[PDB]
A paper describes a structure:
Crystals belonging to space group P212121 appeared after 8–12 weeks, diffracted to 1.85 Å and contained two molecules in the asymmetric unit. Surprisingly, the resulting electron density lacked the previously crystallized polymer adhesin domain of PrgB, and instead only contained residues 584–1233. There is also no space in the crystal packing to allow for a flexible polymer adhesin domain, so it was likely cleaved off in the crystallization drop before the crystals were formed. The modeled protein indeed consists of four Ig-like domains: two CSA and two CSC domains. In each of the Ig-like domains of PrgB, isopeptide bonds are formed between a lysine and an asparagine, a bond which is further stabilized by an aspartic acid. Refinement of our structure indicated that Mg2+ was the best fit to the density.
One of the best studied adhesins is PrgB from the conjugative plasmid pCF10 of Enterococcus faecalis, which has been shown to play major roles in conjugation, biofilm formation, and importantly also in bacterial virulence. PrgB is the main adhesin produced by pCF10 and has been studied for well over three decades. This protein is around 140 kDa in size and possesses an N-terminal signal sequence and a C-terminal LPXTG cell wall anchor motif. PrgB, which is indicated to function as a dimer in vivo, distributes over the entire surface of the cell wall and increases cellular aggregation, biofilm formation, and the efficiency of plasmid transfer. PrgB seems to consist of an N-terminal disordered region (residues 35–197), followed by a newly identified coiled-coil (COI) domain (residues 198–257), the previously crystallized polymer adhesin domain (residues 261–558), a linker region (residues 559–582), four immunoglobulin (Ig)-like domains (residues 583–1232), and finally the C-terminal disordered region containing the LPXTG motif (residues 1263–1305) that gets anchored to the cell wall.
Author numbering:
A (entry chain B): 585 to 1233
B (entry chain A): 584 to 1233
Write the structure that this text describes.
């Protein structure tokens, strides 16, 4: 036979049985020797050509690029470098126009043209090389090629070549960005806080091992939703396999950013392409033994709430393939708030209160944007999940046992936190014991913090509270609330008869003379926002000088109604609404519950309220006699001024 | 006639009958014998005139040399004790003590007028004669009374009886936390106080009683510090415990009176705090004697030595000293956490040379021996936590996070009491108790054991330091540092014609059909290797289109060693029987058998470095350039050799 030969080539070497990739531009070369046919009369050669059967499902052949060359029969067609030099030098002569070429589906035929006498027009004694340039489609699996040499009425088959197109697709992921370093956990389908910077990971497909193609271009494109993702300009690229460049091996994982060109259109349409030096290195033989792949990390700031999708499109040899689509979600920032209530549950911001009153601070702890889908890898978990409150320790005292945290269903969950008190600075920090576990079981809702405090005795002025939420370092402050503590000043005086105008403070009281100690209570202001639950005076009498025989009265210093409607006018005797005990030389006069209830009625909040008390005594010995009264309001004691009377001996 | 003598008790200005007094008070009894009715009789018939006073010598002290008699105008009101004191001071009431015979016998003072030759008393009748008996209250309890009798010739008339009370009240000492200079509210008595803690000693005065009739002449408290344990820092403050009016201002209970207190400081050891003259004067104002008076000093000391530390104070009230109770605190040694590094067999390998894939198991002690239920929690900020920190070299080892453990001194795993925080960027792990105070009550008082296993990374070399640190409520104590070494390795691939050859054919032409060998030289296992090799193998992915392998392979010993059963192996020996071969998917894999691994981990072989050479026989099949690279796996960690190349023409 004639032994026609068939090879597949990248243009320099035999690439039979090698892996190729979408868009590869390669060649088949079929040689039909006519050396043996040079021995007969050339006029007896009336048919000469090649019928080539290729796989049009997997490769594309442009008939206008098909060529036939007349080579010296000494040329070793197996030496594909020598063939390319021969084609380039002209020692393999282009004779294509002396052939009839046809393409039909899987079939390319090249037959020599014939003279009028029927004999083929080209000389025998030469090797004729049919060159079929082809382009690999974006397909999977094998493709074979075989040919037949046609000589007059006979046919001889060539050897069969084959190439493979292994599967590999581009992909995209989302990674955390800790001060520029890439995290190692995927953030797909997770929740990213506003202003967090994250990495988009755009991963090329893999170039297969034992590569017989040529990487002519390699690029990755990412079009960003610029209303949600702000490209910061910071990016890097790494090689995912060992890559030799010049005299050095760039090991797998090494940065190759310098070899990647960025085309940035308005921070929206970003294209990363390999430069010429890198493409040249990829085409060197040792880099085709193993796989090659690369990935780009591009940094975006999340600037808007919602669901944010990302996709990339990989260009390999002009063949575009889109990756998977990744999504992340961005919630509204937390909106923690602060309020102040009284003991009845009523809101009393800006309200005036008195010693011993309960100021119940109620805060919302807003964890609606932090739940099981949170991107924990974006934060330093050790910074904790906490709530902080800065109260005025010079004016209020927290009831530490009653600090509670409740969830949105009203369930006490205080036991999930450690509570740290800083008494000197007057702050309290509530910290989740197990932050990640806490976000999983209790996140996704608003929590309610209750911080009861009590107004101190003998302080006045404005009382501020503020608070702050700290979620893994995201610090959001609440509003500030304020209460007012008007100064009070209960007084003691001395009068001869109940209702006298002339003070006897500092005056002479004779032996056997009867007189009255007079008391004026603290004022509760108009629109008082607290709740008075106790109101009394204690007068420790100097029993050797002042003799108490049970005489006392209390008078209204304001107009008010009782719960049962009965009116009380300023100056009225209301001793019926008070009680008196005398024990261990102490006169104690105490407001009844009927009087307290009256002081707390909304109907009486239009005016301020106070009362006057009188304690009847007889001076029974000589000397100087001091008197001070202790007034108790909400069980908090303060002292009147100290009065003085003189009984000379 | 008839006579009514009077007896009064005074602080010098006022009637103090029935009032409360205090140790060391300086007071006076005054007995008035009126002789106005006796002025009408013949003075020669008055032959005996005087007073016999009966006091409580068990409760007050009278010095006879201070007893005086004054001759006062009969119009002087001896009940106006201010008027009496002025008359005595000016001489308007004349001192006639020289005309009296005075005597003190136990509970009795007698003062009798002297007499002329005829027996008549030497002093004129018609005056009031005031006998003044100054006394000092002793440190006693309960009541003391005084009564006198006026003697007129053979008659006797008793005076009224006066009485005072000595209510009991002692000084005290306590110990309070010192947080940023503010005083804690929890008593640290008998609690555990770490070294370098600043605490407040609280020295509290006794109480001056309500309804006071005395005079506070001086008031001080003294504290002698043990300067080997307590370093006085120089800062202190004082508070009043009751309302104290000064001038026309009222210092309410609890407010600071430091400006009125003086500190005499002898060498930071002997501290005495005393009320200044302005405060003493305010304490004598009448309104300040109605109710109680008392004060406290807070003095700051740094605890600078371990052991049991006692403190006591001595209160000086009107020169009478009373010692307070004695408080005690305890100071244990600081924690002594340690760090060690063990290989996978459990041997300590500090300074040991190690290799890729080897386990460096860091074992640390977490010393909480001094932190138990008696700990003074009020001295620390609880938010600072209870934690243990390890800073490993993240560029050379990687931790096996799932195997981090904490155990107590009884071997119980307690890892779930802690939050484990990994910082991969700085290469640290922080182990913090979820509930720090509760954790100390439940698990404090023992030594905990922390296990942090790590593996050596592939393709790294040099020194590997590890250190750790114990943070107990802000008390930071470092462990020792351990170090390991990772000698560089360089397994290589080469090309030769025959196994023994030395002429490298890397980069040379090998003709078509020619048979040759790929040569591999393993990584070195160092002399004195401290790790453990559990896997050692090479994989060579052959270019099957060009290199034809048909089962020819050899492994040569590159060092001398011995086996478990005794067999001796020399350098250059063929040891292929201690290796196995597979040829799957064009990849030749040559693997060390367990018996060769067992050999490389024997102590007997540790004197020398160890490696091996392998040879893979191949026949070249096609023309063109042919590349070869080998991946060597050591403890399942892969690194690759140099890449060789050969050329075949035609
Ligand atoms: Mg505060
Ligand atoms: Mg580190």
């Amino acid at each position: 036979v004639l032994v026609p030969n068939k090879e597949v080539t990248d243009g320099q070497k035999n690439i039979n049985d090698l892996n190729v990739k979408r868009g590869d531009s390669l060649q088949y070369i079929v040689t039909g020797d006519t050396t043996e046919l040079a021995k007969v009369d050339p006029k007896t050669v009336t048919k000469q050509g090649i019928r080539d059967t290729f796989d049009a499902e997997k490769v594309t052949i442009d008939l206008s690029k098909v060529k036939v060359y007349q080579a010296d029969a000494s040329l070793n067609e197996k030496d594909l470098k020598a063939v390319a030099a021969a084609i380039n030098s002209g020692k393999a002569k282009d004779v294509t126009a002396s052939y009839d070429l046809n393409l039909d589906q899987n079939t390319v035929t090249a037959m020599m043209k014939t003279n009028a006498d029927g004999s083929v027009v080209l000389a025998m004694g030469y090797k004729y090389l049919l060159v079929l340039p082809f382009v690999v489609k974006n397909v999977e699996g094998d493709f074979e090629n075989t040919a037949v040499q046609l000589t007059n009425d006979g046919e001889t088959v060539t050897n069969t070549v084959i190439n493979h197109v292994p599967s590999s697709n581009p992909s995209k992921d989302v990674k955390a960005d800790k001060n520029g370093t890439v995290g190692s956990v995927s953030l797909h389908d997770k929740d990213i806080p506003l202003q967090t910077k994250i990495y988009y990971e755009v991963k090329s497909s893999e170039r297969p091992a034992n590569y017989g193609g040529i990487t002519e271009e390699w690029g990755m494109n990412d079009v960003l939703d610029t209303t949600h993702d702000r490209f910061t300009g910071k990016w890097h690229a790494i090689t995912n396999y060992d890559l030799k460049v010049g005299d050095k091996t760039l090991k797998a994982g090494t940065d190759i950013s310098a070899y990647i060109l960025l085309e940035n259109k308005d921070n929206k349409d970003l294209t990363f392409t390999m430069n010429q030096a890198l493409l040249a290195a990829l085409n060197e033989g040792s880099n085709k033994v193993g796989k090659q792949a690369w990935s780009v990390y591009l940094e975006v700031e999340r600037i808007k709430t919602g669901d944010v999708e990302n996709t990339q499109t990989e260009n390999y040899n002009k063949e575009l393939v889109r990756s998977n689509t990744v999504v992340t979600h961005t919630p509204d920032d937390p909106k923690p708030t602060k309020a102040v209530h009284n003991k009845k549950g009523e809101d009393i911001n800006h309200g005036k209160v008195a010693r011993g009153d309960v100021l119940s601070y109620e805060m919302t702890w807003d964890l609606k944007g932090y739940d099981k889908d949170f991107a924990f890898d974006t934060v330093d978990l050790a910074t904790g999940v906490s709530f902080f409150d800065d109260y005025d320790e010079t004016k209020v005292t927290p009831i530490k046992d009653l600090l509670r945290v409740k969830d949105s269903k009203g369930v006490d969950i205080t036991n999930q936190f450690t509570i740290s008190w800083d008494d000197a600075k007057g702050t309290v920090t509530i910290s989740a014991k197990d932050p990640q576990a806490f976000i999983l079981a209790y996140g996704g809702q608003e929590l309610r913090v209750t911080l009861p405090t009590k107004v101190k005795a003998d302080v006045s002025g404005d009382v501020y509270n503020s608070a702050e939420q700290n979620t893994f370092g995201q610090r959001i402050k609440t509003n500030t609330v304020v209460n007012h503590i008007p100064k009070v000043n209960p007084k003691k005086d001395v009068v001869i008869k109940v209702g006298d105008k002339q003070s006897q403070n500092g005056a002479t009281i004779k032996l056997g003379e009867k007189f009255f100690y007079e008391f004026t209570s603290s004022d509760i202001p108009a629109e008082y926002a607290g709740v008075v639950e106790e109101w009394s005076i204690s007068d420790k009498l100097d029993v050797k000088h002042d003799k108490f025989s049970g005489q006392w009265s209390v008078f209204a210093n304001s107009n008010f109604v009782l719960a049962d409607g009965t009116k009380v006018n300023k100056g009225d005797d209301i001793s019926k609404l008070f009680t008196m005990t005398f024990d261990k030389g102490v006169v104690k006069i105490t407001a009844s519950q009927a009087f307290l209830d009256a002081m707390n009625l909304k109907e009486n909040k239009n005016v301020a309220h106070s009362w006057k008390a009188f304690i009847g005594v007889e001076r029974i010995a000589a000397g100087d006699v001091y008197n001070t009264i202790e007034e108790s309001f909400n069980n908090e004691k303060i002292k009147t001024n100290t009065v003085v009377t003189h009984t000379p001996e």
